[PDB]
Design a protein around this ligand. Structure first.
Ligand code: L8A
Length: 223
């Protein structure tokens, strides 16, 4: 493919993302002032770990649906065999949610948008996972500090889903070509937007997997 075809791929991936971004960026930034009261935090803190794991897993399932809808809106992904479409979505859907999460994160007060309002990491106190909640706040802080754009999330998550390294793939070569083109599309877009600077400042690829595997470990016990 040509440089015009790489540009078209960027546009397409960014179009698919915007159509499935779940919550509008403009809405999320406006709601940054809409913070939960002390009695509202207390209300969540009083809830059972099972009630909180039920709510979090409900929102996670909901978020994963938009991720599946994002991958379904990618031409190359649809061309893959069903087993490969499943293998990539099972291994990457939750990792994509953890990346998408930075839009709902506010670095000015260390709060995240959860159930209509912004709340601190003390909102999730009931789970008994202070280490795990800190880990997802720190990860969203590492991306929000960089001011990770909508298009940047779009291309990064496309690379998270399309990874030929995943075990269980039959058409590894086909996925490799899709990964290579998206890698080329990501770097080309960073040049066009003068964001080459953020590449070295991004999470060390393997960290997202370390964070996700530790979370599925805690989740599998309750779901
Ligand atoms: C704007 C946008 O696209 N968004 C923002 C709103 N959404 C979220 O942020 N979502 C949807 C579900 C969210 C979510 C649920 C559960 C986890 C866990 O790691 C857990 F251990 F923490 F529980 C897992 F259960 F996996 F173990 C992680 C994320 S959430 O909103 O419930 C949430 C946000 C911040 C947070 F500290 C904790 C939870 C993330 C969806 C994506």
């Amino acid at each position: 493919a040509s440089l015009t075809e790489i540009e078209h791929l960027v546009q397409s991936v960014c179009k698919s993302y915007r159509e499935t971004c779940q919550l509008r960026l403009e809405d999320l930034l406006r709601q940054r002032s809409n913070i939960f009261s002390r009695e509202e935090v207390t209300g969540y803190q009083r809830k059972s770990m099972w009630e909180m794991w039920e709510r979090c897993a409900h929102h996670l399932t909901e978020a994963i649906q938009y991720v599946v809808e994002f991958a379904k809106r990618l031409s190359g992904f649809m061309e893959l065999c069903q087993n490969d479409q499943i293998v990539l979505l099972k291994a990457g859907a939750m990792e994509v949610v953890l990346v998408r999460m930075c839009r709902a994160y506010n670095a000015d007060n260390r709060t995240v948008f959860f159930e209509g309002k912004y709340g601190g990491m003390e909102l999730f106190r009931a789970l008994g996972c202070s280490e795990l909640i800190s880990s997802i706040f720190d990860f969203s802080h590492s991306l929000s500090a960089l001011h990770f754009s909508e298009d940047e999330i779009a291309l990064y998550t496309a690379l998270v889903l399309i990874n030929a390294h995943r075990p269980g793939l039959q058409e590894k070569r086909k996925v490799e070509q899709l990964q290579y083109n998206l890698e080329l599309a990501f770097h080309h877009h960073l040049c066009k937007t003068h964001r080459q600077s953020i590449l070295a400042k991004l999470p060390p690829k393997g960290k997202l997997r370390s964070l996700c595997s530790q979370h599925v470990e805690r989740l599998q016990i309750f779901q």
